[PDB]
Every structure is written in structure tokens, then in C-alpha cells.
Design a protein around this ligand. Structure first.
Ligand SMILES: [Fe+2]
Ligand SMILES: [Mg+2]
Length: 124
């Protein structure tokens, strides 16, 4: 329901994903603050895919699901974030088509949303 609760849930996705990858707290918290590097290394991008998968927004094929993302937005996000998240999804749903690598699809879709609505966006 709340922002505080969302943060906790995001921390639980981070802790489940970050160990798998060669990634440090400094980088991860940058993502949480809407700071998405343009040229990250493969580990940061694949971390972002791990998050998306965990959040239930990615398909087995490694694509970002519009319907699943909408459902998660509506089910989970606080009102502070909800409407801007829907707009960011409209704005960014095609970002993935430019990328074969699912890690790229997930990372650059998330960067798209961060750069579009930095006031509201948080990343786990
Ligand atoms: Fe952090
Ligand atoms: Mg690195």
C-alpha cells in the first residue's frame, strides 16, 4: 500500500538478485535514485533483468510484458507512483524492441522510465 512498504519489497528483490551478480551497493542505490548509466556493464543490466523477472513483468522469452506490468502497477504501486508509472509504460513499452539481449531490454526499459519520470520512479 505505502511508499515505506514498497521500499521494503524493493529491498527484498534487491537482496534476492544482487548476490548473483558482480554488483556493489553504490551502483544499486544509484538505480534506486533514478541514476541509470548509459553504458553500464553487463552485470548491472542483467541485475535489472533479474529484478524485472522477480517482479513478474518479464516473459519466459525475456520480453517485458505490457499486461503483466500494468497489472503489477495497479496491484502494488502507491498512488504517488501509479499514474506516472502507467505513463512511463506507454512511453517506454517499445524501448525493448531495439534490443536482442533480455538484460538490455530490461535495463534500458527501466532507464527509459527513470529518465521519463524521475520524480516518481524508484528501482529495486
Ligand atoms: Fe541501497
Ligand atoms: Mg561494475
Amino acid at each position: 500500500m505505502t511508499m515505506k512498504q514498497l521500499t521494503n519489497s524493493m529491498d527484498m528483490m534487491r537482496q534476492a538478485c544482487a548476490p548473483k551478480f558482480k554488483v556493489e551497493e553504490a551502483e544499486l542505490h544509484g538505480l534506486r535514485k533514478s541514476i541509470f548509466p548509459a553504458n553500464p556493464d553487463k552485470e548491472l543490466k542483467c541485475y535489472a533483468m533479474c529484478i524485472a523477472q522477480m517482479a513478474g513483468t518479464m516473459t519466459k522469452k525475456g520480453e517485458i510484458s505490457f499486461s503483466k506490468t500494468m497489472a503489477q502497477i495497479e496491484a502494488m504501486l502507491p498512488p504517488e507512483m501509479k499514474t506516472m508509472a502507467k505513463e512511463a509504460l506507454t512511453h517506454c513499452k517499445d524501448t525493448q524492441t531495439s534490443y536482442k539481449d533480455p538484460c538490455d531490454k530490461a535495463y534500458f526499459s527501466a532507464k527509459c522510465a527513470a529518465d521519463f519520470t524521475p520524480d516518481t520512479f524508484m528501482f529495486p
